[PDB]
Amino acid sequence: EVETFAFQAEIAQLMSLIINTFYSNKEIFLRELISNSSDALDKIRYESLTDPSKLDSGKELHINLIPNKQDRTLTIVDTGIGMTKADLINNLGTIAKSGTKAFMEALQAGADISMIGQFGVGFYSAYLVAEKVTVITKHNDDEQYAWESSAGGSFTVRTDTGEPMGRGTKVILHLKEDQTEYLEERRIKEIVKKHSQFIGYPITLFVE
Amino acid sequence: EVETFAFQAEIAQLMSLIINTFYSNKEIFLRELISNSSDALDKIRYESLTDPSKLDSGKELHINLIPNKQDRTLTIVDTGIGMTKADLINNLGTIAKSGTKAFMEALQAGADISMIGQFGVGFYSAYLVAEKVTVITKHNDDEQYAWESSAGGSFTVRTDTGEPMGRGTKVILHLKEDQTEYLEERRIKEIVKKHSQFIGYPITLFVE
Numbered sequence: 001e002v003e004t005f006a007f008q009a010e011i012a013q014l015m016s017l018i019i020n021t022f023y024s025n026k027e028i029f030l031r032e033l034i035s036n037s038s039d040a041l042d043k044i045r046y047e048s049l050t051d052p053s054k055l056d057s058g059k060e061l062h063i064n065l066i067p068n069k070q071d072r073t074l075t076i077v078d079t080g081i082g083m084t085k086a087d088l089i090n091n092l093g094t095i096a097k098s099g100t101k102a103f104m105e106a107l108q109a110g111a112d113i114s115m116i117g118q119f120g121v122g123f124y125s126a127y128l129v130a131e132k133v134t135v136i137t138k139h140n141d142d143e144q145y146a147w148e149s150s151a152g153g154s155f156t157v158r159t160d161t162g163e164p165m166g167r168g169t170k171v172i173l174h175l176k177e178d179q180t181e182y183l184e185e186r187r188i189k190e191i192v193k194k195h196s197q198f199i200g201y202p203i204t205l206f207v208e
Numbered sequence: 209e210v211e212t213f214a215f216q217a218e219i220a221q222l223m224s225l226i227i228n229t230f231y232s233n234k235e236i237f238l239r240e241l242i243s244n245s246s247d248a249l250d251k252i253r254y255e256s257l258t259d260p261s262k263l264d265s266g267k268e269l270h271i272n273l274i275p276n277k278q279d280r281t282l283t284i285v286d287t288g289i290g291m292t293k294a295d296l297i298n299n300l301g302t303i304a305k306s307g308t309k310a311f312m313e314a315l316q317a318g319a320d321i322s323m324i325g326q327f328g329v330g331f332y333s334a335y336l337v338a339e340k341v342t343v344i345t346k347h348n349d350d351e352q353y354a355w356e357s358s359a360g361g362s363f364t365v366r367t368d369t370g371e372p373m374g375r376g377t378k379v380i381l382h383l384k385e386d387q388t389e390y391l392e393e394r395r396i397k398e399i400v401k402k403h404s405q406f407i408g409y410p411i412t413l414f415v416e
């Protein structure tokens with residue numbers, strides 16, 4: 001039922017660096033996760049241009065932000081292309097090995113952590129604020145899977161039992177105890193407005 | 209031998225807006241074309257992770273900048289994934305219709321033209337400096353094609369007779385007469401350094 005995998009060495013390094021480096025500008029995590037969602041939504045849109053049946057799993061193309069103070073979770077949901085089992089195992093469809101190298105050579109030459117997205121490993125910025133991340137995904141060519149990691153060198157993949165989602169990806173951020181500001185409506189709004197105001201898909205901030 | 213196609217209405221509008229709007233910060237075109245090249249290079253890299261034979265058409269992953277003062281051309285060459293005939297016809301593999309809408313709603317709300325890349329139509333920024341653009345491309349699943357457009361509502365596609373390129377995409381910018389500064393070594397260097405210093409693939413600026 002549950003497979004456990006080792007992160008590649010470069011990715012494990014990246015995650016340990018995100019977790020342990022003092023860096024106050026943590027809010028960028030949300031920009032990078034919304035930007036990944038927008039990329040994935042572009043992808044199914046593009047595909048549907050030539051094969052409309054691709055959207056039979058769902059025609060609405062949107063991003064939802066869902067805070068939950070009781071579980072201490074912030075979830076980013078999109079109806080993008082989703083990920084197959086293989087994509088999830090391949091560092092979530094990232095070029096994470098070569099991107100991590102290029103990120104850390106960039107950091108050697110004066111970049112800061114907010115430029116992570118430029119190396120195609122912006123996902124891992126989730127670890128600025130989360131002690132654990134759970135990704136639920138469904139791609140048209142595969143079944144629903146759950147990926148999970150509390151970092152520490154390893155992740156899991158299983159088939160996901162819960163609510164079918166039709167098509168796309170849900171990132172559930174189990175927030176660090178001192179990072180609950182990212183569950184507040186006003187804070188989320190500020191951040192979206194500041195860093196993601198022109199995203200071309202509607203972003204709905206859910207209330208509690 | 210040569211097929212002629214109409215741009216979609218939204219794209220034709222976009223191109224006319226790029227061509228006719230007064231906007232002094234034209235240099236951004238190069239950032240956006242390098243960023244497209246980096247995306248395409250990421251794509252073949254990703255694909256090769258699971259199928260190494262994808263790189264039989266060429267293992268080197270790089271971007272070349274080639275100025276030619278005699279032809280008044282600036283060419284951006286990459287060894288990325290390339291484009292199939294169908295991608296080229298579909299506005300160069302862009303979501304150009306929905307992206308153009310989102311770009312122009314963004315411009316209504318205070319964005320400037322330099323944010324074009326955020327709507328996935330950054331290619332068309334070529335028209336800030338070029339009176340004509342020629343794209344030569346080769347994808348592993350298809351033959352070599354040449355796309356061309358001087359804007360004006362139409363583009364052409366033909367099979368390309370010339371030098372085989374193995375795999376990737378070449379953008380040839382036939383520069384406007386008053387935009388020859390983008391053929392000068394010092395200028396290209398300044399622009400790459402300013403806007404593309406952390407791209408993760410080597411960028412080679414050719415001399416004349």
Ligand SMILES: CC(=O)Nc1cc2nc(N)sc2cc1C
Pocket residue numbers: 036037040043078080081082083084087092093094168169
């Ligand atoms: C096939 C593909 O590109 N899948 C994909 C979807 C996706 N959705 C997100 N929200 S991050 C993400 C990453 C990948 C690779």
Ligand SMILES: CC(=O)Nc1cc2nc(N)sc2cc1C
Pocket residue numbers: 244245248251286288289290291292295300301302376377
């Ligand atoms: C298949 C695919 O994504 N092709 C692709 C390659 C490409 N190369 C560039 N330099 S722009 C570009 C656009 C597309 C769609």
